[PDB]
DNA sequence: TAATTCCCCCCCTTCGGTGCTTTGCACCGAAGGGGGGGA
């Protein structure tokens, strides 16, 4: 039936009238199902027949309902959505099974015909009119309007979520020792009661829901483990993901690569060691989503490793608030990191990866800090607290990094774990000039019109070298001059430049960059033994 | 007093809510249930398209929680100084924010004061509330209680027309020239007077000068380090020539070579030291323009800051030394420095400054709420490039 | 063809803003596209 809950008042934007879009020609097999569904809904009173007093119209269509022989009826409300007032969404995330706790009794429930059990605002019903075209040809068409929440409207989900919360609140008030997770119309109920006393509480909840016009059919009422919930399989002592199937083909297109990357990203939440960078690099520069992409050798190796990782049964465990949260981080190379969150050794609560590249130039310390921050934020949403970190970096390295850095940075309570490869800085700049070494006053200028430039130097001993350049900007000749100084010198060298841009790049101690000149300079800096950089105004 | 109306052409706040920890969620739920029970806030639905963030802070030495709302976007869209508070021995700040929770808010305007409380692990969709009374944090809220405010502390004001009181947001700054044991007694009398009817030292503030290095022997590198400082300082102080110190920097020489100073260069150096020991002339406060505050990290728990309205025209320069989280926590020290600078700026001029924080965005948004202990929130932006050699200050 | 809405995540691409002086080069940050998952 229809809930006696109050309706949410809605309105149109000022100056907008309403849609008048005509209906596109529908197929016969869809038309018959639409007619049957509409007849049933009109019998139950969810839609109302409309006449020649309503000038609005909006096309309708239908799709298939998951693993069922039923149909889902939808309306293309794009114009009405354009002219409809703005809402504020109340759903802020998705519950995770790793955030659950161990309960002695569990039940999963689903509400049948969720949207069609919530009334729609009376003054807004005239804008929801639609027409069901005749089979082939016969009558002009039967015109209806909606009395309940339609599927396809921009305001329906928030209204339904608020109404469901309002309905559920009184029951949760009187039973504070029963855990209820609600997502849209899906309900997960957990308790520490005996099974016999758990069934009675479930029946009382079902009666309370029915009193408000919401039905819970026995088809989607789960009573025995394992339980299917939000794409996961829940067992009494462990949880896992529902089976993930990877496409197995010999010719790959851009769309197939996109879907495979998405599936691997989804699977990387419980399977440890998933890497997608080599597969993801193939998406750069391609345009059409049907173009055959020849797989490289660095991507085939990644695919072969990920395929072997997913051949083993992997499960998680539930949260225990009486213990500690431990997150351990490992480095995989090429700016990729993995992490595991657990409470007891060799029993993971969850796993994850981090491979974002932020900035033109960076080192290993900054990426580790970014990964720590991301893990901290994720652990606050799921568990509400920050874990203890196990980082592969020496305490002396972090101490000497954060004290000399010009920004402010911090890492929460952590301890060092000796698992190679470790995080370290590859070179350091002298704080004082080196006595008994060449000075290498360098310079470089360019012309902005011809886009031509030069970069040279001179030393105290008397050596000079000038190298003309081409197709370079003004702030590239300075880097070229610094590279020239680093090349034609010994192991210990002073350098005096005229540019703050190059000095600011170099002083951050990068080890990777998107520029080949900076990458050359990084290797030349690692090669040397003692380097000092000084700036002088022009 | 019927606040009415936003700024012409503006719409309203539409800011999302950041996640919180379990203790903060529990405290917020406990506070909001009691607040709703007394008619201060009311539950709303999704048809209200406005939102502002909220969180909670534990005040020092109180062992209780306070709820804070980020009413920063509402303030800029809303339509419609004692120059003796800086010269005062002891100044105290008192919380008078609890007074606003008796004056109701206009029916037309309360839709803009909407906020959402999240849940741990997203077990339930968020719960929304809107204010029925004047909220704590909005700029137009004290400007309504002000007419009623001009009459509460009058039986304490005309008695002793020496104490200077000034109100910003929810805070009352009260200052006198009494002893630390008698100023406290007068503040206690004011507390009693407030109860029945329903420690800063500004004189210890000084600027931070620019000091030129003093040495007996000067190398080529040392001279190069000095000319680079004088060239930058010539922007703030017009009249510095620095044309003889660069004459002995001609030619290619080893950085560790000792250059004897010419007497002409010595005279120039002494005169430029003399023109650096005086305050800058030609800088005034424009009440219409905004204030900008820059912070630089110096290491070993030392920070420097500059407050100015126009580039190279500094209104104040200062240095902050650490006291909590000693060389262990950096976000804590930066947060404390920001709070201190904001407090100093409210006592003078009157407008809170806009901060150029020397931090990354994500770490700040992650960790700044764990140490904040004020009731106002200044607007800020983050810098990314290295500022300079940073030895100017 | 084939058609809808809301939420979370990842990865790639464009354009606007800033600001250093270089007046347009270099760097960064949002919004949009594709894909995964949920109802
Ligand atoms: N593809 C979709 N488009 C629009 N709304 C959708 C879609 N899928 C789900 N919803 C919304 C509307 C549904 O009423 C609500 C709950 O989904 P679901 O339980 O699968 O369907 P239902 O409750 O209408 O039918 P059933 O009787 O099979 O449970 O979520
Ligand atoms: Mg379902
Ligand atoms: Mg359902």
Tab-separated table of C-alpha atoms in Angstrom, chain B residues 6-322:
chain	number	residue	atom	x	y	z
B	6	UNK	CA	21.404	38.596	2.234
B	7	UNK	CA	23.767	40.624	0.079
B	8	UNK	CA	22.240	41.557	-3.302
B	9	UNK	CA	23.061	38.967	-5.946
B	10	UNK	CA	24.195	36.264	-3.507
B	11	UNK	CA	22.513	32.920	-2.860
B	12	UNK	CA	23.710	31.200	0.317
B	13	UNK	CA	26.108	28.642	1.782
B	14	UNK	CA	26.441	25.287	0.023
B	15	UNK	CA	29.489	23.813	1.776
B	16	UNK	CA	29.866	20.077	2.368
B	17	UNK	CA	30.644	18.411	5.694
B	18	UNK	CA	34.019	16.825	6.560
B	19	UNK	CA	34.284	13.539	8.496
B	20	UNK	CA	34.778	13.469	12.264
B	21	UNK	CA	36.040	11.031	14.893
B	22	UNK	CA	33.933	8.840	17.162
B	23	UNK	CA	34.292	11.007	20.275
B	24	UNK	CA	33.353	14.161	18.365
B	25	UNK	CA	30.330	12.403	16.838
B	26	UNK	CA	29.154	11.211	20.255
B	27	UNK	CA	29.616	14.658	21.807
B	28	UNK	CA	27.815	16.358	18.914
B	29	UNK	CA	24.856	13.975	19.163
B	30	UNK	CA	24.639	14.495	22.931
B	31	UNK	CA	24.770	18.285	22.562
B	32	UNK	CA	22.279	18.429	19.685
B	33	UNK	CA	19.661	16.249	21.387
B	34	UNK	CA	19.624	18.638	24.356
B	35	UNK	CA	19.651	21.680	22.056
B	36	UNK	CA	16.646	20.400	20.093
B	37	UNK	CA	14.800	19.504	23.302
B	38	UNK	CA	14.889	23.187	24.352
B	39	UNK	CA	13.737	24.591	21.004
B	40	UNK	CA	17.081	26.047	19.916
B	41	UNK	CA	17.318	23.950	16.728
B	42	UNK	CA	14.777	22.048	14.653
B	43	UNK	CA	15.054	19.095	12.290
B	44	UNK	CA	14.664	19.817	8.573
B	45	UNK	CA	14.608	17.825	5.355
B	46	UNK	CA	16.336	17.674	1.970
B	47	UNK	CA	14.200	20.458	0.455
B	48	UNK	CA	16.532	23.000	2.097
B	49	UNK	CA	19.478	23.418	-0.322
B	50	UNK	CA	21.897	25.142	2.098
B	51	UNK	CA	24.509	23.686	4.438
B	52	UNK	CA	27.481	24.670	6.614
B	53	UNK	CA	30.067	22.434	8.311
B	54	UNK	CA	30.170	21.758	12.049
B	55	UNK	CA	32.576	20.129	14.491
B	56	UNK	CA	33.445	20.018	18.197
B	57	UNK	CA	36.327	21.242	20.359
B	58	UNK	CA	37.276	20.541	23.974
B	59	UNK	CA	38.135	23.780	25.762
B	60	UNK	CA	41.310	23.728	27.838
B	61	UNK	CA	41.024	22.859	31.544
B	62	UNK	CA	37.247	22.409	31.380
B	63	UNK	CA	36.784	18.736	30.411
B	64	UNK	CA	33.669	19.549	28.390
B	65	UNK	CA	32.833	19.848	24.703
B	66	UNK	CA	31.726	22.872	22.684
B	67	UNK	CA	30.100	22.812	19.250
B	68	UNK	CA	31.443	25.088	16.508
B	69	UNK	CA	29.919	25.995	13.135
B	70	UNK	CA	31.980	27.254	10.183
B	71	UNK	CA	29.896	30.347	9.417
B	72	UNK	CA	32.493	31.816	7.062
B	73	UNK	CA	30.598	31.747	3.756
B	74	UNK	CA	27.454	33.185	5.365
B	75	UNK	CA	29.374	36.195	6.707
B	76	UNK	CA	30.684	37.352	3.315
B	77	UNK	CA	27.183	37.210	1.785
B	78	UNK	CA	25.371	39.097	4.574
B	79	UNK	CA	24.490	42.771	4.104
B	80	UNK	CA	25.115	45.116	7.053
B	81	UNK	CA	37.458	51.083	17.074
B	82	UNK	CA	38.794	51.725	20.584
B	83	UNK	CA	42.352	52.967	20.002
B	84	UNK	CA	43.242	52.530	23.650
B	85	UNK	CA	43.108	48.770	24.133
B	86	UNK	CA	46.679	48.195	22.925
B	87	UNK	CA	48.041	50.442	25.706
B	88	UNK	CA	46.846	48.326	28.626
B	89	UNK	CA	48.614	46.211	31.256
B	90	UNK	CA	46.315	43.175	31.535
B	91	UNK	CA	43.581	42.166	29.077
B	92	UNK	CA	41.189	39.253	29.619
B	93	UNK	CA	38.841	37.476	27.203
B	94	UNK	CA	35.488	36.101	28.372
B	95	UNK	CA	32.872	33.923	26.676
B	96	UNK	CA	29.529	35.695	26.218
B	97	UNK	CA	28.246	33.427	23.459
B	98	UNK	CA	25.636	31.793	25.688
B	99	UNK	CA	23.582	35.013	25.667
B	100	UNK	CA	22.573	34.666	22.009
B	101	UNK	CA	20.605	31.468	22.693
B	102	UNK	CA	17.614	33.438	23.978
B	103	UNK	CA	16.906	35.810	21.043
B	104	UNK	CA	14.993	34.042	18.239
B	105	UNK	CA	15.987	34.415	14.598
B	106	UNK	CA	13.859	35.837	11.799
B	107	UNK	CA	11.633	33.258	10.110
B	108	UNK	CA	12.784	34.333	6.629
B	109	UNK	CA	16.502	33.960	7.401
B	110	UNK	CA	16.850	30.718	9.376
B	111	UNK	CA	16.960	28.499	6.274
B	112	UNK	CA	20.551	29.622	5.638
B	113	UNK	CA	21.750	28.230	8.997
B	114	UNK	CA	21.553	24.530	8.130
B	115	UNK	CA	24.057	21.830	9.077
B	116	UNK	CA	24.391	18.044	8.973
B	117	UNK	CA	25.743	15.534	11.503
B	118	UNK	CA	27.431	12.450	9.983
B	119	UNK	CA	27.570	8.911	11.356
B	120	UNK	CA	30.348	6.392	11.939
B	121	UNK	CA	30.754	3.982	8.998
B	122	UNK	CA	27.802	5.650	7.210
B	123	UNK	CA	25.357	3.452	9.116
B	124	UNK	CA	22.571	6.055	8.827
B	125	UNK	CA	22.005	8.997	6.464
B	126	UNK	CA	23.011	12.297	7.991
B	127	UNK	CA	20.720	14.230	10.322
B	128	UNK	CA	20.006	17.866	9.468
B	129	UNK	CA	19.117	20.776	11.744
B	130	UNK	CA	18.455	24.488	11.406
B	131	UNK	CA	18.676	27.234	14.002
B	132	UNK	CA	15.681	28.964	15.556
B	133	UNK	CA	17.711	31.424	17.671
B	134	UNK	CA	20.790	33.530	16.973
B	135	UNK	CA	23.761	31.219	16.279
B	136	UNK	CA	27.342	31.412	17.519
B	137	UNK	CA	29.736	32.349	14.727
B	138	UNK	CA	27.641	34.503	12.409
B	139	UNK	CA	28.765	38.106	11.975
B	140	UNK	CA	25.218	39.482	12.035
B	141	UNK	CA	24.388	37.787	15.344
B	142	UNK	CA	26.430	40.047	17.683
B	143	UNK	CA	25.315	43.058	15.621
B	144	UNK	CA	21.729	42.325	16.736
B	145	UNK	CA	22.408	41.741	20.451
B	146	UNK	CA	24.500	44.938	20.465
B	147	UNK	CA	21.617	47.273	21.349
B	148	UNK	CA	20.731	45.020	24.280
B	149	UNK	CA	24.472	44.732	24.992
B	150	UNK	CA	24.942	48.490	25.444
B	151	UNK	CA	22.864	48.226	28.632
B	152	UNK	CA	24.089	45.084	30.393
B	153	UNK	CA	27.626	46.168	31.356
B	154	UNK	CA	26.664	49.816	31.999
B	155	UNK	CA	26.182	49.319	35.795
B	156	UNK	CA	29.826	48.244	35.663
B	157	UNK	CA	31.081	50.760	33.052
B	158	UNK	CA	30.158	54.266	34.261
B	159	UNK	CA	31.342	53.319	37.762
B	160	UNK	CA	34.971	53.151	36.554
B	161	UNK	CA	35.476	54.909	33.182
B	162	UNK	CA	39.043	53.607	32.958
B	163	UNK	CA	38.503	49.969	31.967
B	164	UNK	CA	38.209	49.483	28.198
B	165	UNK	CA	35.865	46.756	26.923
B	166	UNK	CA	35.420	45.771	23.274
B	167	UNK	CA	33.386	42.898	21.836
B	168	UNK	CA	34.284	40.749	18.826
B	169	UNK	CA	32.003	37.862	17.830
B	170	UNK	CA	31.315	35.911	21.039
B	171	UNK	CA	34.318	37.303	22.933
B	172	UNK	CA	34.643	40.244	25.328
B	173	UNK	CA	38.075	41.884	25.632
B	174	UNK	CA	38.366	43.763	28.938
B	175	UNK	CA	41.454	45.729	29.909
B	176	UNK	CA	42.685	47.773	32.872
B	177	UNK	CA	45.915	49.024	34.494
B	178	UNK	CA	45.532	47.174	37.792
B	179	UNK	CA	47.746	44.676	39.586
B	180	UNK	CA	47.482	40.992	38.553
B	181	UNK	CA	45.759	40.314	41.889
B	182	UNK	CA	43.273	43.198	41.643
B	183	UNK	CA	42.473	43.058	37.930
B	184	UNK	CA	41.422	39.461	38.610
B	185	UNK	CA	39.133	40.675	41.408
B	186	UNK	CA	37.553	43.274	39.113
B	187	UNK	CA	37.036	40.593	36.452
B	188	UNK	CA	35.425	38.390	39.123
B	189	UNK	CA	33.078	41.287	40.014
B	190	UNK	CA	32.179	41.582	36.314
B	191	UNK	CA	31.534	37.824	36.205
B	192	UNK	CA	29.234	38.089	39.231
B	193	UNK	CA	27.401	41.047	37.681
B	194	UNK	CA	26.878	39.073	34.470
B	195	UNK	CA	25.710	36.022	36.434
B	196	UNK	CA	23.093	37.912	38.450
B	197	UNK	CA	21.689	39.701	35.369
B	198	UNK	CA	20.649	36.548	33.543
B	199	UNK	CA	45.377	36.936	30.437
B	200	UNK	CA	46.986	39.062	27.726
B	201	UNK	CA	49.672	41.733	28.152
B	202	UNK	CA	49.515	43.988	25.072
B	203	UNK	CA	52.212	46.343	26.394
B	204	UNK	CA	54.801	43.569	25.837
B	205	UNK	CA	54.450	43.668	22.027
B	206	UNK	CA	57.339	44.893	19.871
B	207	UNK	CA	58.284	44.860	16.200
B	208	UNK	CA	61.067	42.728	14.731
B	209	UNK	CA	63.828	44.800	13.078
B	210	UNK	CA	66.100	43.812	10.201
B	211	UNK	CA	69.670	43.154	11.357
B	212	UNK	CA	72.740	43.236	9.106
B	213	UNK	CA	75.436	40.687	10.022
B	214	UNK	CA	78.455	41.888	11.998
B	215	UNK	CA	81.844	40.335	11.264
B	216	UNK	CA	85.546	41.156	11.338
B	217	UNK	CA	86.519	39.330	8.124
B	218	UNK	CA	84.299	39.184	5.040
B	219	UNK	CA	84.545	36.634	2.235
B	220	UNK	CA	83.211	36.961	-1.306
B	221	UNK	CA	80.324	34.657	-0.384
B	222	UNK	CA	79.529	36.783	2.677
B	223	UNK	CA	79.503	39.965	0.580
B	224	UNK	CA	77.252	38.243	-1.961
B	225	UNK	CA	74.884	37.213	0.843
B	226	UNK	CA	74.717	40.848	1.993
B	227	UNK	CA	74.177	42.564	-1.370
B	228	UNK	CA	71.301	40.168	-2.025
B	229	UNK	CA	69.743	41.312	1.256
B	230	UNK	CA	70.293	45.038	0.671
B	231	UNK	CA	68.708	44.830	-2.791
B	232	UNK	CA	65.561	43.294	-1.294
B	233	UNK	CA	65.563	45.759	1.618
B	234	UNK	CA	65.769	48.700	-0.807
B	235	UNK	CA	62.149	47.996	-1.775
B	236	UNK	CA	60.898	48.564	1.779
B	237	UNK	CA	63.370	51.418	2.451
B	238	UNK	CA	63.836	53.745	-0.567
B	239	UNK	CA	67.179	55.550	-0.498
B	240	UNK	CA	69.568	52.600	-0.272
B	241	UNK	CA	72.035	52.769	-3.168
B	242	UNK	CA	74.149	49.603	-2.633
B	243	UNK	CA	76.492	50.676	-5.439
B	244	UNK	CA	79.883	50.481	-3.688
B	245	UNK	CA	79.329	47.055	-2.110
B	246	UNK	CA	78.778	45.680	-5.624
B	247	UNK	CA	81.933	47.347	-6.977
B	248	UNK	CA	84.124	44.935	-4.981
B	249	UNK	CA	82.025	42.047	-6.361
B	250	UNK	CA	83.380	42.453	-9.903
B	251	UNK	CA	85.170	39.521	-11.496
B	252	UNK	CA	85.254	35.779	-10.870
B	253	UNK	CA	86.752	34.837	-7.500
B	254	UNK	CA	86.662	31.917	-5.093
B	255	UNK	CA	83.718	32.029	-2.697
B	256	UNK	CA	86.040	31.617	0.316
B	257	UNK	CA	88.430	34.410	-0.699
B	258	UNK	CA	88.762	37.231	1.828
B	259	UNK	CA	88.023	40.688	0.398
B	260	UNK	CA	89.227	43.637	2.530
B	261	UNK	CA	86.575	46.319	2.923
B	262	UNK	CA	87.243	49.701	1.341
B	263	UNK	CA	86.727	52.669	3.662
B	264	UNK	CA	84.122	54.105	1.272
B	265	UNK	CA	82.341	50.746	1.439
B	266	UNK	CA	82.616	50.802	5.239
B	267	UNK	CA	81.005	54.254	5.350
B	268	UNK	CA	78.222	53.088	3.026
B	269	UNK	CA	77.669	49.974	5.147
B	270	UNK	CA	77.433	52.024	8.346
B	271	UNK	CA	75.004	54.506	6.786
B	272	UNK	CA	72.809	51.671	5.466
B	273	UNK	CA	72.823	50.142	8.946
B	274	UNK	CA	71.666	53.524	10.255
B	275	UNK	CA	68.806	53.695	7.729
B	276	UNK	CA	67.757	50.225	8.902
B	277	UNK	CA	67.379	51.047	12.605
B	278	UNK	CA	64.450	53.456	12.051
B	279	UNK	CA	60.764	52.677	11.434
B	280	UNK	CA	59.428	52.869	7.897
B	281	UNK	CA	57.759	56.197	7.086
B	282	UNK	CA	54.689	56.446	4.873
B	283	UNK	CA	52.554	53.505	6.021
B	284	UNK	CA	49.004	54.072	7.283
B	285	UNK	CA	45.960	51.909	7.983
B	286	UNK	CA	43.180	52.192	5.418
B	287	UNK	CA	39.910	51.097	7.098
B	288	UNK	CA	38.443	49.878	3.786
B	289	UNK	CA	41.204	47.552	2.562
B	290	UNK	CA	41.800	44.081	3.993
B	291	UNK	CA	44.695	42.711	6.033
B	292	UNK	CA	47.102	39.996	4.874
B	293	UNK	CA	49.272	37.922	7.222
B	294	UNK	CA	52.261	35.923	5.973
B	295	UNK	CA	53.998	33.255	8.066
B	296	UNK	CA	57.455	31.771	7.484
B	297	UNK	CA	58.961	28.738	9.212
B	298	UNK	CA	62.472	29.303	10.571
B	299	UNK	CA	63.185	25.922	12.177
B	300	UNK	CA	63.915	24.868	15.758
B	301	UNK	CA	60.394	25.890	16.754
B	302	UNK	CA	60.685	29.460	15.451
B	303	UNK	CA	58.264	31.273	13.152
B	304	UNK	CA	58.068	34.779	11.716
B	305	UNK	CA	55.052	36.738	10.538
B	306	UNK	CA	54.243	39.968	8.716
B	307	UNK	CA	50.959	41.897	8.635
B	308	UNK	CA	50.491	44.397	5.805
B	309	UNK	CA	47.777	45.920	3.623
B	310	UNK	CA	49.933	46.818	0.596
B	311	UNK	CA	53.063	44.957	-0.574
B	312	UNK	CA	56.329	46.201	0.967
B	313	UNK	CA	54.316	48.392	3.352
B	314	UNK	CA	54.412	46.367	6.572
B	315	UNK	CA	52.048	47.297	9.388
B	316	UNK	CA	53.562	44.811	11.841
B	317	UNK	CA	56.411	42.305	11.988
B	318	UNK	CA	56.827	39.651	14.646
B	319	UNK	CA	58.360	36.360	15.765
B	320	UNK	CA	56.735	33.427	17.569
B	321	UNK	CA	58.560	30.823	19.658
B	322	UNK	CA	57.151	27.399	20.448
